[PDB]
From a paper:
The proteolyzed complex provides a high-resolution view of the core [name]–[name] interface. The [name]–[name] binding interface is quite small, burying 491 Å2 of surface area per molecule in the full proteins. The area of the [name] Ox domain most distal from the dimeric interface (residues 223–231 and 303–306) makes a small interface with one end of the A domain (residues 1321–1323, 1468, 1512–1513), burying 491 Å2 of surface area per protein. The interaction features a network of hydrogen bonding, including two central salt bridges, between [name] Asp225and [name] Arg1513 and between [name] Asp231 and [name] Arg1512, plus side-chain-backbone and backbone-backbone contacts. Single point mutation of A2(R1512D), A2(R1513D), [name](D225R), and [name](D231R) each leads to disruption of the [name]–[name] complex, as observed by gel filtration. Peptide synthesis assays with [name](D225R) and wildtype [name] decreased oxidation by ~50%, which confirms the importance of this [name]–[name]_A2 interaction. Isothermal calorimetry binding experiments between A2 and dimeric [name] reveal a Kd value of ~75 nM.
Numbering used by the authors:
A (entry chain B), B (entry chain B): 129 to 171, 177 to 255, 259 to 319, 321 to 323
C (entry chain A), D (entry chain A): 1297 to 1435, 1439 to 1571
Write the structure that this text describes.
Amino acid sequence: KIQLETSGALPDIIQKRRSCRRFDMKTPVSFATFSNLLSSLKQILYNYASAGGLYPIDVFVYVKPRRVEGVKAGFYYFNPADHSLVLVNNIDQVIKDDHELINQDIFAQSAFSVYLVYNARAKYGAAGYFYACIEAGIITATLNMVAEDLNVGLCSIGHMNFEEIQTFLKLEDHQVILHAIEGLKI
Amino acid sequence: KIQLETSGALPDIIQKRRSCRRFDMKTPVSFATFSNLLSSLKQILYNYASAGGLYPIDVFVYVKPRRVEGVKAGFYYFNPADHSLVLVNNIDQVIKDDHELINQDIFAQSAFSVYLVYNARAKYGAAGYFYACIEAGIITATLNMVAEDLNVGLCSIGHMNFEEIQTFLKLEDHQVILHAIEGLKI
Amino acid sequence: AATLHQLFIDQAQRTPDQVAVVFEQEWLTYSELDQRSNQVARFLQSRGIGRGDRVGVLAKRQVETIINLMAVLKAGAAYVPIDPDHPYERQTYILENSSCKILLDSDLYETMEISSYADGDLTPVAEPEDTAYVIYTSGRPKGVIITHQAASNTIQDINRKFEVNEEDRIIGISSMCFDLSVYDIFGTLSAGATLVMIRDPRDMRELVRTVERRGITIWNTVPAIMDLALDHVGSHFENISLRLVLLSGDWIPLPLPAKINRHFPVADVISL
Amino acid sequence: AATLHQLFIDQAQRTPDQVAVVFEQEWLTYSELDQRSNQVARFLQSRGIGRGDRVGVLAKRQVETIINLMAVLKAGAAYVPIDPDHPYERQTYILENSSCKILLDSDLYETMEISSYADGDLTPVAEPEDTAYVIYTSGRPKGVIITHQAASNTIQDINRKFEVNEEDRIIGISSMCFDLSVYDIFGTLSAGATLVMIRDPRDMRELVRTVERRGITIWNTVPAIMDLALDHVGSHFENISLRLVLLSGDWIPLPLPAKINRHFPVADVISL
Ligand SMILES: Cc1cc2nc3c(=O)[nH]c(=O)nc-3n(C[C@H](O)[C@H](O)[C@H](O)COP(=O)(O)O)c2cc1C
Ligand SMILES: Cc1cc2nc3c(=O)[nH]c(=O)nc-3n(C[C@H](O)[C@H](O)[C@H](O)COP(=O)(O)O)c2cc1C
């Protein structure tokens, strides 16, 4: 039966953050801002924890037309080894029907989409998946805070019709999407 | 086929953090530091994301004898509603045998232990567990960073014999531990 | 003043790496299409195809078909589109009536090993006053001759009036035996835009899905097609990529305009 | 100068909310034990128990047993521990030989509704020179009388020499029919420490597990018990809570000292 200090701390990237859902659909995300928000998974040594130095979460992003200076619209695969973005599909694009119900307008105003995919290789034998789900939350939380170092709004999406997102990204049978995030606000 | 800026950003709570495994077993964690590291899940509105405003991750902590000013050794249940710590067991204590293999000396030097338990209630029907695993990674990442605002070292533990930790905490059948963390360093 | 292939040849220089035509997972850039159609054109010339001739082209919904149409025009001949779904008796009548020299199918490029020809620019042959294609109608079928100049004037008047450019995407709904498809192909390629081809023009639910999935900006059909497409769409559907709906015809079902602007609010509806 | 229960009574004042004795999930604070043993003591007095008498107490490994032992001493009598595992013939011999008035079992407090008695301090009865308990030995059994003063001097000499205090935990391994248990009980309660009781003294793997799980700091047994305990322990086991190993006896197996200090490096090994 103990009481704790409610008197202290200076939360700046943790309290100034919050699930954002309204974005300025007019200002582009400066090529600097974007290339830094994505610095987090730079890369072996990374800036976040991972079970057994495995880092199996492959990250993809979708970019809306002309809403990120320096990036053509399309689906990209970010590379940690190079801090790079290779285009994988620029003809197709995610649509409102890929989302559902309450998430229609979130994606509408969004600028870009971040996808966290569990690269199912090794060491744990079907517990690496459990460890991957935690790693997706780890990654999510770093990004959401680093997005507060730069006034980038963020909102997590639990479920979503990854049925065809799966193919537009060219995922394997051993690649399964776990989490998605929509990411400037005013 | 695109390249990104490796030129920028100021990571302070994200790069200055790292899995710590050596602790000063002599200096106690000041009652302020401890009560602030635990401010993160203060609490409805919290300082981290949660699927559907559910926040089902109940948090427990174990405290070693005389290594945290103002806290008797024992097992505690932190309360978000009150920012409080109720003792649940001060006779028993976690032992090296509860850990395994490579994790023996981590717990040895540790000062306290943080346990993240998935309160299995509601809305998603067995997908709330999946959403809880991500939330544990979310919680883990905020704590690890807030522990960098205060020079508190942290290290995640994937597996551990929660067989009897389960009972010393008085967990239900609907409470399942997901993650554990050992937390000053030099 | 203009030929259809020269209009495209000029745009290939301006934007070589722009995607010119996509079917499903197949695609061609402006320079790939220019290069390969130069080679097929040379192959056709080795077969005596030149000025004054007519070349049959099966109107398969494939990117290679675009290669063939452009090659016929580059060799100096006019193409006669043949609907692959018509019975053989109707196909034969049209080929004879138009005095076609040969009939071209897709896969021509690969199985004749035409990559072995030079892919550089050809010596001009066709003049603005020469025939570019022959469209047969009212299937009894009457073939109508269309010159390079008449077609160029039409597609350029449209490109200029509605400012079609590199950011635009045209959905290739109508058969390439139909006159409306001449804009889908050569109007797109004259403005630097992208043609998105369709496998089945009767799969309505896929037509409206392609508009969302591939960011279609320009819809160019008869009124009936748009009407039937909006029957297979949700009550609260709304698409913002479509900015231009070209409808050709005098007969428009009465609630269609109001329907287009509920499900395509950005779309400008034109009744030419 | 001292009685066993007064030593504890004084410590209950200093630390009322310290845990005095834990069995498994049962436990008593210093004031709960003082309060309840005052009530049982009054119940015993209503039964004529007083100075000069002997009271049999079944040595069950329960916290209530501690209540009863303390109550007998508070009522002014001496207790005679009875081993619940001995045959009835041996139990009877000891009860008659020691002229015990009654035999006490655990659950006495509940089923006689003794919470209804006053729980306040009693009027002193026992003097340092009065008998505190009678230990029978070499089971033929000979009962040895021990006064309050002789027992107090022993437990206090040990508490002072090794600085036993509130931070200490004693594991109650030996039977309460054995003399070593008088320190486990009253030495613990004279110093403000905590007694951790054991269900089965022969379950070696549980003895060494209790040392880790409940932070045992003091081990007080004959050499044989520690020797058998270290046979059921891992090669690389090491515990740092145990600081004091009290071994009473002349016969120590030769590798045991070296063994104790490999698996209990902080432990000071005393051969009294
Ligand atoms: C794993 C996860 C999945 C989520 N999925 C969704 C979602 O599908 N739709 C949505 O609107 N919000 C989603 N959220 C966000 C929460 O519903 C909500 O915003 C929560 O309140 C976190 O933001 P807050 O900081 O404002 O509370 C998700 C959050 C998490 C952690
Ligand atoms: C979910 C999870 C579980 C982990 N479990 C363990 C563990 O059991 N033992 C361990 O030594 N490290 C564990 N780690 C930490 C990683 O093994 C390792 O420290 C990783 O390198 C992260 O720290 P870094 O920032 O130094 O890389 C875990 C990390 C995560 C994310």
